[PDB]
Amino acid sequence: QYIVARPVYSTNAFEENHKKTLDHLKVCCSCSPQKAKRIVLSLFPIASWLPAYRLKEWLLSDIVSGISTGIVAVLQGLAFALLVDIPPVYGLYASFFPAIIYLFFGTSRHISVGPFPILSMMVGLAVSGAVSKAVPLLDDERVRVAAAASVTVLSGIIQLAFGILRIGFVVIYLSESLISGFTTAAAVHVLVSQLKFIFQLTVPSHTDPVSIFKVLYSVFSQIEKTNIADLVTALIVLLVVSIVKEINQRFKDKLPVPIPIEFIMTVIAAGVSYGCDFKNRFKVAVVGDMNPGFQPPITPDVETFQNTVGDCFGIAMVAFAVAFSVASVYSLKYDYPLDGNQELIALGLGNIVCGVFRGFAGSTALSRSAVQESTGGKTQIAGLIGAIIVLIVVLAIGFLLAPLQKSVLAALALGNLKGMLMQFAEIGRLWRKDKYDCLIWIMTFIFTIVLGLGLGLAASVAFQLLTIVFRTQFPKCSTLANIGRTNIYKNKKDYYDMYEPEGVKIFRCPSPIYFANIGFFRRKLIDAVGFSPLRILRKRNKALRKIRKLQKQGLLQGFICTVDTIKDSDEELDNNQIEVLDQPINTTDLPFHIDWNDDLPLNIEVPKISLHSLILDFSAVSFLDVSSVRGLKSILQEFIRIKVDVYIVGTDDDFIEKLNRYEFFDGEVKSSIFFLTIHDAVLHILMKKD
Amino acid sequence: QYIVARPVYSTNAFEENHKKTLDHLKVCCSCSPQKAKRIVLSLFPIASWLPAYRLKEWLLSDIVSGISTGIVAVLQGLAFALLVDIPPVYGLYASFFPAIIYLFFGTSRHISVGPFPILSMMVGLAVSGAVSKAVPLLDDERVRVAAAASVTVLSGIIQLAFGILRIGFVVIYLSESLISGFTTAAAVHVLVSQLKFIFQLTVPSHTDPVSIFKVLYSVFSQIEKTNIADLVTALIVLLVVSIVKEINQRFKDKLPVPIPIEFIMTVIAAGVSYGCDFKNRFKVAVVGDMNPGFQPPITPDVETFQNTVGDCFGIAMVAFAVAFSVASVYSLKYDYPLDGNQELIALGLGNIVCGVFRGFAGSTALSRSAVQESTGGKTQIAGLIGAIIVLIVVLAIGFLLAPLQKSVLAALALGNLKGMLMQFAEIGRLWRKDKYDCLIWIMTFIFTIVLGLGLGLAASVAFQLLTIVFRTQFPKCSTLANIGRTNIYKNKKDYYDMYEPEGVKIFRCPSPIYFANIGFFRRKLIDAVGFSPLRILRKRNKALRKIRKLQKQGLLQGFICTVDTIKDSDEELDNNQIEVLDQPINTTDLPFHIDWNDDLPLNIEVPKISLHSLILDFSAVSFLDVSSVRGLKSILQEFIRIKVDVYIVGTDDDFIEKLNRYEFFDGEVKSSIFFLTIHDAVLHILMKKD
Numbered sequence A, B: 001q002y003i004v005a006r007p008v009y010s011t012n013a014f015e016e017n018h019k020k021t022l023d024h025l026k027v028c029c030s031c032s033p034q035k036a037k038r039i040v041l042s043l044f045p046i047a048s049w050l051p052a053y054r055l056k057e058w059l060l061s062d063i064v065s066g067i068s069t070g071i072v073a074v075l076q077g078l079a080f081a082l083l084v085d086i087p088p089v090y091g092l093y094a095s096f097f098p099a100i101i102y103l104f105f106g107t108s109r110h111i112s113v114g115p116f117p118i119l120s121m122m123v124g125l126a127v128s129g130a131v132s133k134a135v136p137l138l139d140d141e142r143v144r145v146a147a148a149a150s151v152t153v154l155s156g157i158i159q160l161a162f163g164i165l166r167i168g169f170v171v172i173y174l175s176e177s178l179i180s181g182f183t184t185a186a187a188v189h190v191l192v193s194q195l196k197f198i199f200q201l202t203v204p205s206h207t208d209p210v211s212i213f214k215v216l217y218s219v220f221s222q223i224e225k226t227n228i229a230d231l232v233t234a235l236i237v238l239l240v241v242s243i244v245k246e247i248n249q250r251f252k253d254k255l256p257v258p259i260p261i262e263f264i265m266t267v268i269a270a271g272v273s274y275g276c277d278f279k280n281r282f283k284v285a286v287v288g289d290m291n292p293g294f295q296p297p298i299t300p301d302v303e304t305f306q307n308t309v310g311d312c313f314g315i316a317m318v319a320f321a322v323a324f325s326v327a328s329v330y331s332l333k334y335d336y337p338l339d340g341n342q343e344l345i346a347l348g349l350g351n352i353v354c355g356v357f358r359g360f361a362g363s364t365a366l367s368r369s370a371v372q373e374s375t376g377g378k379t380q381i382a383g384l385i386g387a388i389i390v391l392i393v394v395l396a397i398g399f400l401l402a403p404l405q406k407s408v409l410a411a412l413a414l415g416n417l418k419g420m421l422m423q424f425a426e427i428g429r430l431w432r433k434d435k436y437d438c439l440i441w442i443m444t445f446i447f448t449i450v451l452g453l454g455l456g457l458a459a460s461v462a463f464q465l466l467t468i469v470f471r472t473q474f475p476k477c478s479t480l481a482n483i484g485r486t487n488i489y490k491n492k493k494d495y496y497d498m499y500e501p502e503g504v505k506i507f508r509c510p511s512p513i514y515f516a517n518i519g520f521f522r523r524k525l526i527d528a529v530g531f532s533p534l535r536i537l538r539k540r541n542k543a544l545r546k547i548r549k550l551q552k553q554g555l556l557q558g559f560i561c562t563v564d565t566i567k568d569s570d571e572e573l574d575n576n577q578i579e580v581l582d583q584p585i586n587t588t589d590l591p592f593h594i595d596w597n598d599d600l601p602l603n604i605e606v607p608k609i610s611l612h613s614l615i616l617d618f619s620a621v622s623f624l625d626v627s628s629v630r631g632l633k634s635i636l637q638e639f640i641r642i643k644v645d646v647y648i649v650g651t652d653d654d655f656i657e658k659l660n661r662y663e664f665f666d667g668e669v670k671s672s673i674f675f676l677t678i679h680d681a682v683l684h685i686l687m688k689k690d
């Protein structure tokens, strides 16, 4: 049973009966020989797991996973190089250099970095913006490569500058409702942007607010020019891949290393396209012969930095958020301490080295990481084998992809959109849960469809921040009362036999009071008390001025009258003199001790007040700002001058220690109004009144 | 003394011992004859105070205040029409039509609407943007008037659309730190923009990111062309007005209706400029003769709506925020119910009627409202007399301002910048108070100086919203303990003789848990408990799998061994099989009842745990979202499967009623874990353990 027999404490009788107990530059600038061995081995993390490498139980699994992710990285390299309007050889450069740099500088053991379609589509939008903003067949796709490389270099520089300044916690402003709303709209963007390769149409590059319908108009105005031999091949590839992926999602009994339908269908499509001369019989958009070898490095152009300095921030944000959210899943499994700041440095170095050698930007993909982890990827040596496969495709076997339809690539990339399109079926899962994150989802989807991918992310983040203000805009403030003659105080409109003491009003605001809900708090407090205290103070001051005017006239003196009725000379105060009606009342010059409650002398009318104390339950108020401290001080000054005691209960110690440095406590609003709980304020009032 | 002898309640034993107690379209669509008389008399509020008009005590004071504000409105009309590059006659139209419309449609009794310099400067920027974006001496200032009228019409339409949709609470996103940071930067903008009239220079219109230094470069590159006869006159006017304003701020004894130095200095300057032929002796920039009469109305141009649709939103926001913050001061005095939604409708109608008749936009000014209220303005009839004065200046006495220097106007408008420039001396008043609103002030000032007035307001609002996330990003989570063997639980690192029970950990997070602080909450909870529970669950599952493998081999059977030492066959789990290490443990198929704490059989190693229950004090957690509910459910599922009881205390009723519709409670995380306070959870643990 709950038995308590303590005295009544009031936060100053408690702090005197139980006694309590440069700034950062001398702990962060101490050059020690034990700290450099931590800093270097956390900056260059290949010296930490490569000596501690269990060879005999990991090498074969890493080799198998490396081959099985290198084939997928080759097939996804020259398929994401079509979302950018560059030749498809520049997609193989994008999946080789970051996989080499992340081997030396990365912390995650299970992701395989390369390109992934949302970031390559954002790069494809930014390069068309840089082309359309620059001052003055093969000469068009030269400046596309030369500007995509510079967009990649600038995004890597931004990511490296994030990683050096140790701001790796920027992923927490990217809640999963915003990610789930951005991802389906990016999937719709991919599905629309890959229509011009299935139908084999010619679409000009659009870079504007809404461009998901400009591409739709430019495609659907020339449906009569659709190559049937490309559409039939893309439809045949698309329904086989979905059926075999459905079979691979089910049927997982006696089935190790599930059947790769993408590689098999690509081999079959390339063999058919070579054997029957599909470039000459029909007229298809075949992937031409790539130059065997790498390209010499280019200097990044300066005039395209100043044109796309806004899009590279969004590219860096998306490339860090995706590569953190994917890697944290495999970090919760296997229990390794993934470091957020080193990921930005590794991805920035990988993107810089990729952009110097004419690649394009990218981070890890969810499907390639799932292929690398599901087939037994133990460490990042599988990424090295996956990069060696792309190296041997670039150097030697480049002619084997020369009879590739370029519509089977767009059909394969439309294959695994079902993972990002099923999240449409969660709005109903969010409508019956919060109705604020459903709003965040809907507004993120609308802003990403309409305002593109660069501006839509910033607009959805700015709305996600406004949602938190919407949550605490109109709090459900209530009035409390006692249940069962004990220390249980709950809401008055809930239980039956609640007892409320005489002249005590316990008020509770269940939200942190800041600038958007201080006026609402004041209005709700005035409506719950029953009067405005400034109105009663002004009427009391008017009555006191009339009383002392009658005393100066020689009528009053307790307070006996001479005549029964006087004239009702309502001396109204003009401007620049009405501010004396807000002054505190002093009755030291009078012999009587008026209380403004029983009655007054002749034709003096003052509204009555039954209160003598109110209690503010501030147990849920988390913080205050200058506007709340100013408004709260203005409220308590009206409540104290009206002879009503105020108590603020339920606060802990650093709340009072923060309120000390707000110039809150003066000779009127003393520091002895803070009590511990609600019940020892009611007990203090009851032991003070009698 | 505090004596309590209640039983121990657990939010389900409490709700069964004390029994408790279309949606809005049928209360908002009820056409009643008593509701129309409220709606019309709140929409057309001149029918409410004009019959209730105490004539014999208000008429003379309203006439005096009307004359004294009409002179100031005339002198401020054709001085704010120089911040826009229009002829000065179009400033007298801006202070006449809104004062007539606000008489019929306004609620405040003490503001005098007209132009005010921040909004006219924003109009002057937007009109230059509309000129510089339009496709193709007197022909330049024709399109300035024709585009400023359309910017005014669009801003009035936006304000009227705000007032009809009843969103009049948008001023609460405009905290006083943001207003105080925006106002001084607007004052610096006014002081720089009025330099070309003192020196009498020719400056082209700049409309861009940063333009406070483009005007400074265009002025200070041609200092050698400064008219000395204008600079000397502006300096003579400027130091007299400041001295007499200092004398008027002090010396307020036997001094009614303080001496207007602006009208006297304007009369003296005009008389000197006429008597000595200042347009011919020197070569000054005198205010030319205005056409006597109004202008016929124009249709607003459509092509300039689409160019400045972004700036008109900022003009409407500033025009509502200033006219609300000024009117609320005189609404707190005199006690009248000012309505926020009617102010938007009245200002929108005033701006529309002003923009049709070739005026420009505006709301009330602080100085004109102070002049109208301080001289005895009782109602809005003083605004009507102030408009009649502007009418008689436009119609008849227009030649009296024709010898006006146009540098004395810029010198007068630099006079009362001291009210908006002294707020520089509050950063030190905000540095020792919060250091978040000092940051809001500094970032608002920097964004308004750099990004102009239109974009700077939006950027400072977007940073003000981010400040609230910065306040609750890293909360100061703590561990509590008991003081003095009673129901007082406070922070463990504060007091000396705090007692903590055996195996109980009371944890407290003093912030609402949302998406930005759920990972920090999980990391702080794991660091305060002392272990990760998923690690102990995985090691317990590995040990249990080894135990049952030894049982299948025929060695174990309580739990006696056969041999002393076995081989250390560490059967490590591959991928797609390691997720069985997170499953709950069941020991129903074993005869023994292992507890994972004392010891285990041969070479089995499990980490020990001293906990058996932890308590989460959620009294300060105001709300949750889907990310917090998901992460909290994931935390409690690890803590329950490890055989550690969890209790969540300090929550009130609608917190549990909200958590019901989150799919939070299942067969594992039952609803019986919620307790009332901290002490009756500790008492429940102590009465359950023995």
Ligand SMILES: CC(C)CCC[C@@H](C)[C@H]1CC[C@H]2[C@@H]3CC=C4C[C@@H](OC(=O)CCC(=O)O)CC[C@]4(C)[C@H]3CC[C@]12C
Binding pocket: A208, A209, A210, A214, A446, A450, A451
């Ligand atoms: C939820 C909503 C309110 C958020 C804000 C949406 C706006 C950002 C969208 C909605 C309508 C859009 C406009 C709809 C149509 C057009 C015409 C379009 O014209 C062309 O592409 C050229 C046509 C030609 O040259 O003939 C240019 C973009 C624009 C202005 C769009 C710009 C982006 C707008 C303003």
Ligand SMILES: CC(C)CCC[C@@H](C)[C@H]1CC[C@H]2[C@@H]3CC=C4C[C@@H](OC(=O)CCC(=O)O)CC[C@]4(C)[C@H]3CC[C@]12C
Binding pocket: A210, A213, A214, A217, A450
């Ligand atoms: C806000 C969401 C929910 C709906 C979006 C509706 C509109 C904003 C969209 C739908 C149809 C779109 C239009 C569809 C086709 C075109 C043609 C397109 O191409 C041209 O005009 C090329 C030049 C020419 O041929 O004249 C320019 C964009 C435009 C006007 C689009 C502008 C944006 C529009 C009006």
Ligand SMILES: CC(C)CCC[C@@H](C)[C@H]1CC[C@H]2[C@@H]3CC=C4C[C@@H](OC(=O)CCC(=O)O)CC[C@]4(C)[C@H]3CC[C@]12C
Binding pocket: A305, A306, A309
């Ligand atoms: C804290 C985050 C938001 C990054 C820091 C702010 C950036 C958004 C700013 C700071 C430096 C700025 C740059 C400073 C100088 C220039 C050169 C300038 O070159 C010109 O040709 C001038 C005329 C013009 O293009 O407007 C173009 C803008 C640019 C790249 C600016 C683009 C915007 C930048 C990158």
Ligand SMILES: CC(C)CCC[C@@H](C)[C@H]1CC[C@H]2[C@@H]3CC=C4C[C@@H](OC(=O)CCC(=O)O)CC[C@]4(C)[C@H]3CC[C@]12C
Binding pocket: A157, A158, A161, A162, A165, A302, A303, A305, A306, A309
């Ligand atoms: C958000 C924070 C952590 C980012 C910190 C880094 C940025 C402040 C720097 C990194 C690289 C900088 C860029 C490096 C080079 C240039 C080119 C420079 O071009 C010129 O001056 C034009 C010269 C010419 O046209 O001849 C304009 C600034 C800009 C875009 C810089 C803008 C500022 C950037 C993005």
Ligand SMILES: CC(C)CCC[C@@H](C)[C@H]1CC[C@H]2[C@@H]3CC=C4C[C@@H](OC(=O)CCC(=O)O)CC[C@]4(C)[C@H]3CC[C@]12C
Binding pocket: B208, B209, B210, B214, B446, B450, B451
């Ligand atoms: C606190 C800071 C980081 C906030 C972001 C600041 C930017 C929005 C500012 C800082 C530097 C500014 C730039 C500094 C100089 C110029 C050159 C200026 O050039 C001209 O006016 C034309 C010159 C010519 O024609 O010769 C155009 C604006 C611009 C790009 C400014 C645009 C606005 C910028 C990028």
Ligand SMILES: CC(C)CCC[C@@H](C)[C@H]1CC[C@H]2[C@@H]3CC=C4C[C@@H](OC(=O)CCC(=O)O)CC[C@]4(C)[C@H]3CC[C@]12C
Binding pocket: B210, B213, B214, B217, B450
């Ligand atoms: C961010 C805050 C704290 C400091 C701001 C520093 C810069 C962003 C400012 C200071 C000096 C400014 C410059 C001062 C003078 C000019 C000349 C001005 O006029 C012309 O160039 C006209 C055409 C010509 O004559 O070439 C254009 C803006 C510019 C470059 C300004 C651009 C913005 C600058 C670099």
Ligand SMILES: CC(C)CCC[C@@H](C)[C@H]1CC[C@H]2[C@@H]3CC=C4C[C@@H](OC(=O)CCC(=O)O)CC[C@]4(C)[C@H]3CC[C@]12C
Binding pocket: B305, B306, B309
């Ligand atoms: C909820 C708040 C933020 C207001 C609602 C959204 C507005 C910001 C949008 C909705 C309608 C939009 C307008 C819809 C159509 C047009 C015509 C369009 O005309 C053109 O010549 C098209 C090409 C172009 O200028 O880009 C110019 C943009 C404009 C005015 C748009 C400007 C932006 C507007 C006002």
Ligand SMILES: CC(C)CCC[C@@H](C)[C@H]1CC[C@H]2[C@@H]3CC=C4C[C@@H](OC(=O)CCC(=O)O)CC[C@]4(C)[C@H]3CC[C@]12C
Binding pocket: B157, B158, B161, B162, B165, B302, B303, B305, B306, B309
């Ligand atoms: C924030 C919410 C509450 C505002 C609600 C009102 C707006 C949605 C409306 C009110 C007036 C509208 C404007 C009225 C007229 C026009 C002109 C119109 O011009 C054309 O279509 C061009 C025709 C041509 O060039 O021939 C473009 C949209 C625009 C700016 C409209 C944009 C949308 C506005 C601002």
Ligand SMILES: NC(=O)n1c(O)c(C(=O)c2cccs2)c2cc(Cl)ccc21
Binding pocket: A072, A075, A076, A079, A116, A117, A262, A263, A365, A366, A367, A368, A371, A409, A412, A413, A414, A415, A416, A417
């Ligand atoms: N598992 C696997 O081998 N693959 C995929 O999952 C692919 C996708 O459709 C992706 C959509 C978003 C990221 S990947 C894919 C595409 C090609 Cl061209 C070759 C192989 C592929």
Ligand SMILES: NC(=O)n1c(O)c(C(=O)c2cccs2)c2cc(Cl)ccc21
Binding pocket: B072, B075, B076, B079, B116, B117, B262, B263, B365, B366, B367, B368, B371, B409, B412, B413, B414, B415, B416, B417
């Ligand atoms: N009280 C008064 O009569 N006046 C002022 O206060 C003036 C200002 O400087 C203002 C600065 C911001 C708003 S007003 C002012 C200017 C002129 Cl041209 C004529 C009279 C004036």
